[PDB]
Every structure is written in C-alpha cells, then in structure tokens.
Coordinates of C-alpha atoms and ligand atoms in Angstrom, one line a residue:
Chain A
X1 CA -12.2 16.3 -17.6
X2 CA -13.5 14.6 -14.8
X3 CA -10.5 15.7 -12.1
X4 CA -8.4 19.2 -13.0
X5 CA -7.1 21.7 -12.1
X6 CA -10.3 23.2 -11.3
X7 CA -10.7 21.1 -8.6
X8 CA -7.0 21.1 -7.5
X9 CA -7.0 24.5 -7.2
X10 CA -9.6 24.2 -4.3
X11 CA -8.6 24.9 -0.3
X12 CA -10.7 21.7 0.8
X13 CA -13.6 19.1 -0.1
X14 CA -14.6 19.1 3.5
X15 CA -18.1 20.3 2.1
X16 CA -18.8 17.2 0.1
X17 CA -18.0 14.2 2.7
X18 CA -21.9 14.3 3.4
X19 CA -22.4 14.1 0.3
X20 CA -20.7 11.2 -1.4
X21 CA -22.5 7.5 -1.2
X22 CA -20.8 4.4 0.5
X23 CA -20.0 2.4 -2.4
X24 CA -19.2 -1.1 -1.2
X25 CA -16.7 -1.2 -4.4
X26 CA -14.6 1.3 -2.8
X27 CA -13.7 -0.5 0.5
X28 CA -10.7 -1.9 -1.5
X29 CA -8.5 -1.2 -4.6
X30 CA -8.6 -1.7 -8.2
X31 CA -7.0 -4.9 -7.8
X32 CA -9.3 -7.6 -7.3
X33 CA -9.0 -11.7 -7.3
X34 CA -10.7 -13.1 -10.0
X35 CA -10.8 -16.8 -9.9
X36 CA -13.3 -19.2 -12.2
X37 CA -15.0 -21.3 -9.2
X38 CA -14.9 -24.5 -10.9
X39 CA -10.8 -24.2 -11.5
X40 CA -9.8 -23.3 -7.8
X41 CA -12.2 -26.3 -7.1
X42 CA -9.1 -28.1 -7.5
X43 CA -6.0 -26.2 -6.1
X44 CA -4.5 -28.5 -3.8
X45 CA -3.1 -28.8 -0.1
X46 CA 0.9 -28.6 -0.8
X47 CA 4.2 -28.7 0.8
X48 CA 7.6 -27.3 0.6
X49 CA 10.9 -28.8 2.3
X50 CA 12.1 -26.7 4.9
X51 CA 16.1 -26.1 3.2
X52 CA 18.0 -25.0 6.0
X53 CA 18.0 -23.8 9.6
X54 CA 15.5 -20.8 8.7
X55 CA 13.0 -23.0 6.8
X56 CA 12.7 -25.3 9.3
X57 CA 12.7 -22.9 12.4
X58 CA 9.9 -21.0 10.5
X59 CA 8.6 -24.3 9.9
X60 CA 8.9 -25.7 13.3
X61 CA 7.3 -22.1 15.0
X62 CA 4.6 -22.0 12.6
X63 CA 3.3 -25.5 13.5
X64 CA 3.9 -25.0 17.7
X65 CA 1.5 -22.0 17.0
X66 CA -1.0 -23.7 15.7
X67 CA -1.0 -26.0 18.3
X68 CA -1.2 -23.5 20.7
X69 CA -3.5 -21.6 19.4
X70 CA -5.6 -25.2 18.3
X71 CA -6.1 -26.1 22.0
X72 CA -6.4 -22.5 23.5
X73 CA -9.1 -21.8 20.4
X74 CA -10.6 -25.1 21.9
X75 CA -11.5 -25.5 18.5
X76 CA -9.8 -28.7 19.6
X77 CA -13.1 -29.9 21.1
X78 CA -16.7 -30.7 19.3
X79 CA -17.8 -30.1 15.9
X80 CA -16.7 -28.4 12.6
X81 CA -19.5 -25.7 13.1
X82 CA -20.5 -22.1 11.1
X83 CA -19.7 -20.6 14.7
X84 CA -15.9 -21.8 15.6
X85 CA -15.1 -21.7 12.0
X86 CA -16.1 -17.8 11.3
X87 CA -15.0 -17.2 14.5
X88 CA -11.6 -18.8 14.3
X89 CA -11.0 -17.4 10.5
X90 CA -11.4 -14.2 11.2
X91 CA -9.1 -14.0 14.4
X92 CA -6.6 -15.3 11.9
X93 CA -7.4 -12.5 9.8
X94 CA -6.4 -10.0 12.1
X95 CA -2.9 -11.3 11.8
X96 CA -3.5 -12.1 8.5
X97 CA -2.7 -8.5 6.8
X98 CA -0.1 -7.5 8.7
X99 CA 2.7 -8.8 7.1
X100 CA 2.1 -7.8 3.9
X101 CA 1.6 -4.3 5.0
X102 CA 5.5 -4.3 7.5
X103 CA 7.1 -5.5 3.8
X104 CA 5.8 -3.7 1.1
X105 CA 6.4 -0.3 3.5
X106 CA 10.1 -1.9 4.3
X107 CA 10.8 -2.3 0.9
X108 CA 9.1 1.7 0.1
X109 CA 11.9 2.0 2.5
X110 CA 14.9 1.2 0.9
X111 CA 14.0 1.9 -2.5
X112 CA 13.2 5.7 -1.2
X113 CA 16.9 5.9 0.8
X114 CA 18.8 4.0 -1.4
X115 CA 17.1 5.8 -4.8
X116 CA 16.9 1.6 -6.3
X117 CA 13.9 0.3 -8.4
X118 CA 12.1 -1.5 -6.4
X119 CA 11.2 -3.4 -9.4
X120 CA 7.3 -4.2 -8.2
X121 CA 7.7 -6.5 -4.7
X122 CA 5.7 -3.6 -2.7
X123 CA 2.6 -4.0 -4.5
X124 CA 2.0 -7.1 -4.4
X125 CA 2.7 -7.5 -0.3
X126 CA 0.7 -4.2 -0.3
X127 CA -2.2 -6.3 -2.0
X128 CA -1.9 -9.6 0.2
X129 CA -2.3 -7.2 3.3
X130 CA -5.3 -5.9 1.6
X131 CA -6.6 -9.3 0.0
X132 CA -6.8 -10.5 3.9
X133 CA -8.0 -6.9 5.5
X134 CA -10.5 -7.7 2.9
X135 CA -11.2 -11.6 4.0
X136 CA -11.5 -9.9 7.4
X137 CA -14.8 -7.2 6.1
X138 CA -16.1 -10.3 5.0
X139 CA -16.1 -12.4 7.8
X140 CA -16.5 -9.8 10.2
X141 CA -20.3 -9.4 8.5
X142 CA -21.2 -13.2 9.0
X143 CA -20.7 -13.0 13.0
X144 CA -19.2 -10.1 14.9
X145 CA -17.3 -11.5 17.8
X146 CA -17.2 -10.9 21.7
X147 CA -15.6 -8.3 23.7
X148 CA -13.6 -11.2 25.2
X149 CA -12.2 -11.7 21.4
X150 CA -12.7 -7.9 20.2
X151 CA -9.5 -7.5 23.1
X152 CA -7.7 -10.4 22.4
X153 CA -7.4 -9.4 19.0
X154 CA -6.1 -5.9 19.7
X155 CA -3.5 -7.4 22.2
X156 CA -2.4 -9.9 19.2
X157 CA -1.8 -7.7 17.0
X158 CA 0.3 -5.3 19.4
X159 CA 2.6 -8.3 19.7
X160 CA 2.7 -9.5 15.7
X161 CA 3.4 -6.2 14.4
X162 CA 6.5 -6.6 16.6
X163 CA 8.2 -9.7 15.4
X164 CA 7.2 -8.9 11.8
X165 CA 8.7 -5.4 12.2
X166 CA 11.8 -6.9 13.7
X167 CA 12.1 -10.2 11.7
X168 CA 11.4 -8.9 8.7
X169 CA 14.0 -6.2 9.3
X170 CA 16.0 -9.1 10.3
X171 CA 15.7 -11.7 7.5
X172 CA 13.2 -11.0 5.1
X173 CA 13.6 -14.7 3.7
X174 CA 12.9 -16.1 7.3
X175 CA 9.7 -14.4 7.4
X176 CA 8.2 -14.9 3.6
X177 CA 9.0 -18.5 4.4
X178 CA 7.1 -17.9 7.7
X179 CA 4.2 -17.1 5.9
X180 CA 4.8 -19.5 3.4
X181 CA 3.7 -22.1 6.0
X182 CA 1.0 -20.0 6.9
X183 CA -0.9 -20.3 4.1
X184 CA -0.1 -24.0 3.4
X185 CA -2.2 -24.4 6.4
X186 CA -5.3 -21.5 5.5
X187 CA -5.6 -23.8 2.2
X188 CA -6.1 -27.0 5.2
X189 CA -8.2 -25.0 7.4
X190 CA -9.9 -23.9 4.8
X191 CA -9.9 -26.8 2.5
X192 CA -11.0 -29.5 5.2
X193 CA -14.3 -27.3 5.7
X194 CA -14.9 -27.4 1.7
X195 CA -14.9 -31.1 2.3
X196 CA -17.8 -30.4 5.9
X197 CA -20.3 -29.0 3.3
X198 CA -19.7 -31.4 0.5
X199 CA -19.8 -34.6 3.5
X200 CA -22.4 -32.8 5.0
X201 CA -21.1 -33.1 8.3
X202 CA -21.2 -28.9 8.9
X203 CA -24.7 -27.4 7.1
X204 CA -23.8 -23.3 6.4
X205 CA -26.5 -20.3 7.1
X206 CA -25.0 -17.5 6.1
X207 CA -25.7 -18.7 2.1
X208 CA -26.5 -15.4 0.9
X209 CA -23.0 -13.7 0.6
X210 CA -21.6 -10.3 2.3
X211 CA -22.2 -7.6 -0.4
X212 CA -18.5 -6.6 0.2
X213 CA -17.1 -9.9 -0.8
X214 CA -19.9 -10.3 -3.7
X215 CA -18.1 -7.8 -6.1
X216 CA -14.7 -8.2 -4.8
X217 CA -14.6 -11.5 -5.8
X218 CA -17.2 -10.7 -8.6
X219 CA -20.1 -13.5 -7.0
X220 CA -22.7 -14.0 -8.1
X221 CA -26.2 -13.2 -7.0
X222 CA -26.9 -16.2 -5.3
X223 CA -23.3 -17.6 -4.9
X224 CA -23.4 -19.6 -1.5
X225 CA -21.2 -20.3 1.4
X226 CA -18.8 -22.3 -0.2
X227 CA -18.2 -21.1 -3.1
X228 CA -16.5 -17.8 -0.8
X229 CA -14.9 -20.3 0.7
X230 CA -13.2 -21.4 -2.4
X231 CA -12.3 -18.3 -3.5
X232 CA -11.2 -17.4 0.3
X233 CA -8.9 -20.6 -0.5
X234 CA -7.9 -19.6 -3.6
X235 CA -7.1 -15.9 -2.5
X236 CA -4.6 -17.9 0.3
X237 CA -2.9 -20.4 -2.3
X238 CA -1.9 -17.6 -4.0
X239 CA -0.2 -16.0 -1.3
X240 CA 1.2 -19.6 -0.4
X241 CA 3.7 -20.1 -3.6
X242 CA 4.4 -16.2 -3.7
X243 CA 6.0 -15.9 -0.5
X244 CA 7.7 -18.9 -0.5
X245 CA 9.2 -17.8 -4.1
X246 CA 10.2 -14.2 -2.8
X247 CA 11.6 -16.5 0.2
X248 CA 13.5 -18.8 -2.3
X249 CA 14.8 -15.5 -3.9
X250 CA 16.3 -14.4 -0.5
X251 CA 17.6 -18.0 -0.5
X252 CA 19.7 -17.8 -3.5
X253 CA 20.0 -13.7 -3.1
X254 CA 17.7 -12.1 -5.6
X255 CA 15.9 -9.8 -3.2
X256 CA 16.7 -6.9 -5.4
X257 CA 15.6 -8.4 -8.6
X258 CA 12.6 -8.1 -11.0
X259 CA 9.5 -9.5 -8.9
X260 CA 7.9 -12.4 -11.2
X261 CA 4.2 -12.3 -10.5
X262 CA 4.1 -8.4 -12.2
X263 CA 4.8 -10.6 -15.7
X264 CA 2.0 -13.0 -14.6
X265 CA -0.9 -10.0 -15.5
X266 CA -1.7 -11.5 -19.4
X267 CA 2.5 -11.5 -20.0
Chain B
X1 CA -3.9 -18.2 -17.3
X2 CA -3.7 -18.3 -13.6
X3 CA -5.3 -21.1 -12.6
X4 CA -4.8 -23.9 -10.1
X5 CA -2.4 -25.2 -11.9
X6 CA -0.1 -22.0 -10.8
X7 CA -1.4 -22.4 -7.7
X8 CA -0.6 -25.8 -6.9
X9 CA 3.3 -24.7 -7.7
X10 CA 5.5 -24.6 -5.2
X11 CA 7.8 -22.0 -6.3
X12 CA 8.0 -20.1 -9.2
X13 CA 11.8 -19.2 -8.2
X14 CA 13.0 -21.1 -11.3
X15 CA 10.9 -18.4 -13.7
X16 CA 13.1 -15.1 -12.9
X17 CA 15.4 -15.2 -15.7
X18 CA 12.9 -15.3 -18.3
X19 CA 10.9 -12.2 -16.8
X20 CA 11.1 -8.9 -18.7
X21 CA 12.5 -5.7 -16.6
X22 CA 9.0 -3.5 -17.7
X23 CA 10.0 -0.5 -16.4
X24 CA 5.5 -0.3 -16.9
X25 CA 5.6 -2.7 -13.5
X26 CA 7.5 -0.8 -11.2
X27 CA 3.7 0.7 -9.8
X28 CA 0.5 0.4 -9.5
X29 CA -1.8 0.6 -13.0
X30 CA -3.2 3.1 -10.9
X31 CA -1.4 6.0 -12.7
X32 CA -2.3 10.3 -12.7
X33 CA -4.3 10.9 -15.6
X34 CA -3.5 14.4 -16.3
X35 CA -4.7 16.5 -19.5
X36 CA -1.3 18.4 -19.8
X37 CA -3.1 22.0 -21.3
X38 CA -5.8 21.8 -18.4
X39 CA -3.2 21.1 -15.6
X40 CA -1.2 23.9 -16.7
X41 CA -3.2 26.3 -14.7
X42 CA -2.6 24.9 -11.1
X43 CA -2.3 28.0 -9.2
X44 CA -0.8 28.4 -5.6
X45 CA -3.2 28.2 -2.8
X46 CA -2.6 28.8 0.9
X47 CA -5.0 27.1 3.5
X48 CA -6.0 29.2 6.2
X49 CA -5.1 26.7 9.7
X50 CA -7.7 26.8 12.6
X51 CA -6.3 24.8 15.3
X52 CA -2.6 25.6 17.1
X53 CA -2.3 22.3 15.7
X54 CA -2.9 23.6 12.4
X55 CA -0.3 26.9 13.3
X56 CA 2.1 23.9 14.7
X57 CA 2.3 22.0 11.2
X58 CA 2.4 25.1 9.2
X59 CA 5.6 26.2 11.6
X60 CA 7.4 23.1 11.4
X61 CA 6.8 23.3 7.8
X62 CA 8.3 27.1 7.4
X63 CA 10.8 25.6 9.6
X64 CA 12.2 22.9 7.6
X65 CA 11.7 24.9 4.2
X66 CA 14.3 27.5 5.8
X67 CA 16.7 25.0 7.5
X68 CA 16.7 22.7 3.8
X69 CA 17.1 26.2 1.5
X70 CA 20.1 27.3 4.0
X71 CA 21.9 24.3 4.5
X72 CA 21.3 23.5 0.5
X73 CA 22.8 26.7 -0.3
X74 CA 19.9 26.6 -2.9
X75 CA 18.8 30.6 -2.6
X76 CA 22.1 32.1 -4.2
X77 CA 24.2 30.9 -6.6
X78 CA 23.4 31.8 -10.0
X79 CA 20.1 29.2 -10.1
X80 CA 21.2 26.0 -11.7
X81 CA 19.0 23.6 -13.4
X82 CA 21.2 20.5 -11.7
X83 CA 20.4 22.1 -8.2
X84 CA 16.5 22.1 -8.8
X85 CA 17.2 18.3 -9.9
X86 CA 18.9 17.3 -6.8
X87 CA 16.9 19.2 -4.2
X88 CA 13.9 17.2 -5.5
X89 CA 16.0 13.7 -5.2
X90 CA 16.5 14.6 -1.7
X91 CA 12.7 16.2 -1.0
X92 CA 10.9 13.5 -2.5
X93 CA 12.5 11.1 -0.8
X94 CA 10.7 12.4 2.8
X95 CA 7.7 12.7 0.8
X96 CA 7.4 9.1 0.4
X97 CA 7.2 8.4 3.8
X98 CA 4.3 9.7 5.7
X99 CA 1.2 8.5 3.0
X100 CA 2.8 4.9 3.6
X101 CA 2.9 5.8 7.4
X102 CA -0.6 7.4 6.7
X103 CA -1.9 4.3 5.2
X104 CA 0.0 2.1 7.2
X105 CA -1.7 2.9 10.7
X106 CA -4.9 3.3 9.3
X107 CA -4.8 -0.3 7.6
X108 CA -4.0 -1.5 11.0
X109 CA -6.8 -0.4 12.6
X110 CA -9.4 -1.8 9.9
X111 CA -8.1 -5.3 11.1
X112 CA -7.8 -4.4 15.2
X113 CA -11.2 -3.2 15.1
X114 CA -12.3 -5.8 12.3
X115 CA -14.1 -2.4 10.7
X116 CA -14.2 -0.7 7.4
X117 CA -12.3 2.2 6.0
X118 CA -14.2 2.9 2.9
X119 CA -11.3 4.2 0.3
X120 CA -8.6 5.9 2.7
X121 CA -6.2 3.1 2.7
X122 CA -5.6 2.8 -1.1
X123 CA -5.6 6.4 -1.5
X124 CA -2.9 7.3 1.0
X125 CA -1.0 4.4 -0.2
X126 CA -0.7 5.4 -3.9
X127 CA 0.6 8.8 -2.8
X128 CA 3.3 7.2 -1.1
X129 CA 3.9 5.8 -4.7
X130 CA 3.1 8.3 -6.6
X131 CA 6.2 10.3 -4.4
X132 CA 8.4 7.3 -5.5
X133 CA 7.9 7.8 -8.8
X134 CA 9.1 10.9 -8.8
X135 CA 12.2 9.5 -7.0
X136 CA 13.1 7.0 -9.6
X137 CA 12.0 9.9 -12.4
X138 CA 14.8 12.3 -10.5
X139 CA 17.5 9.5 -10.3
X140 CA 17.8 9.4 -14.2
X141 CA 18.4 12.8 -14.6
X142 CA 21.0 13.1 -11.8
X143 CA 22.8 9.8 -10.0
X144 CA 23.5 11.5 -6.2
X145 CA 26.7 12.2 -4.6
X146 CA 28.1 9.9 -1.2
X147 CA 27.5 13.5 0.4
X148 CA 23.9 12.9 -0.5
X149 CA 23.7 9.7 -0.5
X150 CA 24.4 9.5 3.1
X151 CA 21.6 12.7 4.2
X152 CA 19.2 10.6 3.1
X153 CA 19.8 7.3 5.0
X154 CA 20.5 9.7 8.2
X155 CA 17.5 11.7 7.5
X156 CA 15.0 8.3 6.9
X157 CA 15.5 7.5 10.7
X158 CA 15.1 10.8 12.4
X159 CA 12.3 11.2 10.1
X160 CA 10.3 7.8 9.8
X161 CA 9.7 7.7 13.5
X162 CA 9.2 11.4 14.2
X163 CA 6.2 10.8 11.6
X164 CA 5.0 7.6 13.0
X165 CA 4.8 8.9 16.7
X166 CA 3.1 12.3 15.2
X167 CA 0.6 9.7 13.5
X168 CA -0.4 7.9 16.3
X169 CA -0.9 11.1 18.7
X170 CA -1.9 13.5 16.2
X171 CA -3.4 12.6 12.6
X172 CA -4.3 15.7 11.9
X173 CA -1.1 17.6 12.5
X174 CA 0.3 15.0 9.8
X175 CA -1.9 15.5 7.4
X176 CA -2.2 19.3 7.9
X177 CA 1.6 19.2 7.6
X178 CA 1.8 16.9 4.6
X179 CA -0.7 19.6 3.2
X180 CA 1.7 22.6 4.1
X181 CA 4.4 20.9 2.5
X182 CA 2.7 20.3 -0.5
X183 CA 1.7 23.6 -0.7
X184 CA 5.7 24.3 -0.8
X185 CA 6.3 21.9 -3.2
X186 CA 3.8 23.5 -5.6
X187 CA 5.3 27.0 -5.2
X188 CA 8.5 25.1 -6.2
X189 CA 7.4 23.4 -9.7
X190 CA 6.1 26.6 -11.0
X191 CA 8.6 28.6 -9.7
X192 CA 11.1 26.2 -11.8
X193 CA 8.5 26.4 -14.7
X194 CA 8.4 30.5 -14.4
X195 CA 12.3 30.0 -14.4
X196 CA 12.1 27.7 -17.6
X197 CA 10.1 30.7 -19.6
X198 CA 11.7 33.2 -19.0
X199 CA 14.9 31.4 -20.5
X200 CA 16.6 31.7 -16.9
X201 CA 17.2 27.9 -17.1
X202 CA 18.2 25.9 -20.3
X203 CA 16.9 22.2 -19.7
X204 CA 19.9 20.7 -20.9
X205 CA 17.8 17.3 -19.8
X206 CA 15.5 16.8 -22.4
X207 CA 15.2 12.8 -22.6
X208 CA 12.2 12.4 -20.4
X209 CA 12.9 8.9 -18.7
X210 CA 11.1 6.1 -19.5
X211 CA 9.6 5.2 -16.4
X212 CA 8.1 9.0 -16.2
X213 CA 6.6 8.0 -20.2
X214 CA 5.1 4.6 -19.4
X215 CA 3.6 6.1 -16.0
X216 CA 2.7 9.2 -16.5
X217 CA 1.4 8.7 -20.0
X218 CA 3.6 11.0 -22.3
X219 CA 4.4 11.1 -26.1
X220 CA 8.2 10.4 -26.4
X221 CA 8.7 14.0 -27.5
X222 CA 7.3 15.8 -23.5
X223 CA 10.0 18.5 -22.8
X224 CA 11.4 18.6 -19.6
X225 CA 9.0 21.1 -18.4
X226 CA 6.1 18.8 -19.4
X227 CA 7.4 16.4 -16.5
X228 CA 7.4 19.5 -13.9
X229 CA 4.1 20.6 -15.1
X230 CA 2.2 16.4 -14.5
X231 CA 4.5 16.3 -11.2
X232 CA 3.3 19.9 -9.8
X233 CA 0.0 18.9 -10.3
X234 CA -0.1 15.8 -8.2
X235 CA 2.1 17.7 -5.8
X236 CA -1.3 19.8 -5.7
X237 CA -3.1 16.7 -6.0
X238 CA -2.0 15.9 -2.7
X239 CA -2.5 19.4 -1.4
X240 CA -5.6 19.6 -1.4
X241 CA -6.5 15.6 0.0
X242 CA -4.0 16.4 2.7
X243 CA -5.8 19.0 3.5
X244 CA -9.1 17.3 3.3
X245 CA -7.9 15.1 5.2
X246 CA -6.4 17.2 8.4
X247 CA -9.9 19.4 7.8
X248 CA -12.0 15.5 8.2
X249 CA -10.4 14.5 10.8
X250 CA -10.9 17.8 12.9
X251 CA -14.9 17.7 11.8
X252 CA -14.6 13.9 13.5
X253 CA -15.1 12.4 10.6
X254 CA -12.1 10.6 10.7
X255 CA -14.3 7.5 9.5
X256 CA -16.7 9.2 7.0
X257 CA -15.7 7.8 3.5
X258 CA -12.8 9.3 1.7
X259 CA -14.3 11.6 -0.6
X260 CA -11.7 11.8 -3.2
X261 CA -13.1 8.1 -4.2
X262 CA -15.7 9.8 -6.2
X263 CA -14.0 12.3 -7.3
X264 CA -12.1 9.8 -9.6
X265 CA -15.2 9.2 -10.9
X266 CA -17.7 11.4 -12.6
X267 CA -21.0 12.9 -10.5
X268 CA -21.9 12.0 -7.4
Ligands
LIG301 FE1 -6.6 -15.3 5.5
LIG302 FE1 -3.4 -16.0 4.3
LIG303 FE1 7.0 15.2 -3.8
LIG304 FE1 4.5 15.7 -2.1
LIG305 O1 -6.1 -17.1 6.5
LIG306 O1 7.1 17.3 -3.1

C-alpha cells in the first residue's frame, strides 16, 4: 500500500530529502492536546501538601528557584508586558522538556534490562517533554531572544539535565513531585497574565497565532493571544496532577504498576 | 471527558485499582501497519559505506555479530527453535537503546537552540519502542535465565554510554551502525523463516502473545512465523531510515526534514 516492502527493500531515501514539503503538522507527534477553550477557562490555581521530607524539600527548592530566578529575571521590576513575559516563558521552556525526556528514557531503561511491562509511564513523560519542546516552537516565533539569553539557556540546560539525570535516578518520587510544583506555578505565571488581558493592564500584539501552535492545539483562524495562553495553561495543569499522581505512586510504592492516564483516552 | 474538572484534581492516585491492565496501552497508537503477503518479500540489502566512518560502524558491527554468535554458542548445535528465541531477548534488548539515545540528544537540542526538528524526534523515538515491543513479544515465549538475566544489566551500562558518547561526537557512525545492525538482524528473521520452511524447525510456540495481536494487528490464528515475518520487516524498516539517516547527516542535512514523515503518508 502506501509503505512496503518495495520501499524497504531500498539502500537509502537520501534522493528525496529535497523533495519532501515542511509540513508544520509534522514538527510533533500524533498526539496532540485538544482542549474546548471555554472549559480550561476555568481550570484553577491548586495546591498539594508537601507529605514528608521529599515533598517539602522539592517544595521548599522549587519556590527558592523562583525567587532566584524572579529577581535575577528582574521580572521583579516594572510592568506585566508582551516582552518579559514571552521572554521569561520561553526560558522556562528550555527546562521545561527535559524531564519528561530523562524519565520516560529511564523507565525504556529498566523495562528493556529487566524484560518488565512498562505498563505505559514512558509515553506519557515522552509526551510532556514534547508538549513543552512544543510550547517552546511556539514562543520561540513570537520573539527570538538575545545572544546574552541564547547562552544562558545552553549553560542551563547543561546543569538541569544533571540533577534530573541524577535525581531522577535517585528518587523518582522526589522529582515528579518536583515538577509537580513546577507546574502549580506555570498555571500562576500563566494564569495571572490571563487575568493582564482580561484587566487590561498588559494589551498583546502577537494576536495572530504561530502556525505551529495553530494546528497543534487545533486554533482557530483567528484565535488570539490569550486563548494560546489558555491552552498553554491548560497543557501545564495537565502535567501538574500527573506528576504529582506518578509522585503519590512512588509514595505508597506503585511505580511498577498500570499508569492511569492511558485509561483516561475515551475509557 | 477531560476537562477542567480533571484538571483541577490534585491526584488521581486514588483511581489505580479500578484501571484495566490493556495490554493495547503498553505503546504508542502509533503501531507498524504491515500487509503480511506484501511484506513477505523483504529481501536482504547491503549498503555500500563511503566514509572510514562508515568502514568503522560496519567493523564494529561484524565485530559484535562474531563475538555474540561465539560466545552464544548459537552457530553449532543442532539449531534450536528456543535458542533463536532467546538470542533475540538478549539482541533486542541493545536495540532499544540507541533510537531513545538517538531521539534523546536530538530533542535536547530543539530546546538549547529553541529550533525546530521537523519529524526526527518522534520517529527515532518510536523505534526505540517499536524494539521494546519486540522485547515484551520475546519474554512470553521464553522467561530468561539468572545467566541471562544478569548479561543484560552488565551489558546496559557498557553499552548506554558507549552509545551516548558515540552520539554526541559522531551521529553518523550511530546511525550507520544502527543501520549495519539492522541489516544483520534482517539476515536473521529470514534465515529463521528459511529454517521454518524447510521443516528444520517445528514452532512448538504457536500462541502468538497478546501484546504482539493488539500491536501489531493480527487475527488470533498468525502462526509463529507470521510474527517473524511483521518483526523482520520493521527490523528493515529501520534499515533503511538508519541508513537515511547516517547518509543525511553526511550530505549536512542533519536539519533537512525527516523524510520518512511522508513516506507514512501517500504522495508527496
Ligand atoms: Fe511550559
Ligand atoms: Fe510545564
Ligand atoms: Fe530488534
Ligand atoms: Fe533493530
Ligand atoms: O511552563
Ligand atoms: O534487531
């Protein structure tokens, strides 16, 4: 039919690679968010008791972090504007798909040395890491950065993909609960600029949106600012409950057990 | 429905006992769609290298394929059909290692240098997959022993990191190895099919797991041969992307779109 054994058969396709379109469709998988704007209007800033040492030491981290990087960003000082928010998102972004990536590929891990069903976690980290690389192509179409930025990036992510690769080796619960908080906090960021557009107190440009995110998030033709936002937000609360429910599973050991959200696709 | 409402949870811990074990969810929906009478005819290519890189890859991979055959006393011996099983618990379990390294480094760079990819990521990925599920398709026909069992953890470390540091100097000598491989592989599944034929091995295994049904798309009555045969051809499957691969990356076009994005779909 459409791919054989015709085609197997062949040495190499080198010959067609100036030959095949860009399609903006294929910058990601099949597996696309697919929110109802007017629903994930309302998802809603949460929070989750820290229950034990770990909790709270991922809590605690996480929120000395953003205070670090708050004043450093100097977001800190003047207004909620188009410029320091794109800009301050998508550095987040960078970081933002790496931890999906160091767990579903840990996970690929055991599963291939210990011959176990790894009963569908990979996936869905492996989709989180792309959900954000994806946020990223997004944002990184609104407003490229600077080369002061372009390099901070690239050192930040040399010394994340350290502590993920080492903390996630070393408790996997610690760092889903890690991210846990993270996103808690993307729904604020991102929440408290939904609210700058509806008080009028930021005014967007960029209204059009990216074509990439337009059929990702299957937008409409004239979808504006905000409504990526929302789905930007929605994307995030997603991840928020997820990984603080693979967390909780660590918690009460069930790390090796059937992952819920697969049941969650029309069950 | 997954709305807001699911969103606004804070943990859906509590839900696990209730969940089905679908044996459907264990990969992607993204699953080889083979036409079992067309694939039959994948024949066994052998890609002229260029580079010494290219000589390299294919060395390490004659290499290897002696050292495992040897030291698996798999040549002699009157050919057993629970020998062919058990060489490919160990094999594929390498296999699923250097796609995920593959489409590991690459994702990272698509968020270092805030730039597209345009289809490589996913498509490496689902290799890495699609190797598992042979994995998990093996380990029903044959549980391994602590001998084995042990190789494989051993062999994971020297492994992992040999491919890793082999990724970040030289992406083509992985995927031109990768491609080699697979072009071993291949010469292996139809070799055990030949084998199956000519009667020379009886497939005592004839209940085709589930997992291999629901994911490969099989009536419950595909003979054991019937798995080789869908296996092989993704084995060839990645043979020939591989080696796209190693070839695009040599041509510079290490960025061009992947190619093999299309080549799902119909024309160009
Ligand atoms: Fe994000
Ligand atoms: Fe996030
Ligand atoms: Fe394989
Ligand atoms: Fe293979
Ligand atoms: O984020
Ligand atoms: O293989």
């Amino acid at each position: 039919p459409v791919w054989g054994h015709t085609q197997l058969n062949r040495l190499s396709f080198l010959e067609t690679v100036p030959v095949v379109p860009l399609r903006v469709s294929d910058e990601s998988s099949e597996d696309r968010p697919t929110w109802s704007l007017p629903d994930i209007e309302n998802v809603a800033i949460t929070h989750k008791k820290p229950n034990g040492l770990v909790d709270t030491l991922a809590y605690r981290s996480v929120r000395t972090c953003r205070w670090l990087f708050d004043t450093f960003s100097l977001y800190r000082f003047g207004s909620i504007t188009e410029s320091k928010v794109i800009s301050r998102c998508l550095f987040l972004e960078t970081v933002a798909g790496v931890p999906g990536m160091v767990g579903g590929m840990l996970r690929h891990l055991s599963s291939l040395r210990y011959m176990t069903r790894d009963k569908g976690w990979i996936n869905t980290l492996l989709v989180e890491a792309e959900n954000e690389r994806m946020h990223l192509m997004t944002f990184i179409e609104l407003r490229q950065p600077g080369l002061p930025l372009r390099v901070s990036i690239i050192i930040t992510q040399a010394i994340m993909y350290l502590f993920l690769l080492v903390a996630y080796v070393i408790s996997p619960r610690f760092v889903h609960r890690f991210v846990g908080y993270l996103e808690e906090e993307a729904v604020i960021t991102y929440t408290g600029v939904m609210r700058a557009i509806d008080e009028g107190r930021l005014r967007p440009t960029k209204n059009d949106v990216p074509e990439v995110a337009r059929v990702y998030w299957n937008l409409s033709k004239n979808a504006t600012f905000r409504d990526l936002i929302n789905v930007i937000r929605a994307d995030e609360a997603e991840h928020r409950v997820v990984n603080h429910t693979f967390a909780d599973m660590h918690e009460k050991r069930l790390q090796n057990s059937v992952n819920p959200f697969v049941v969650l696709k029309k069950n």
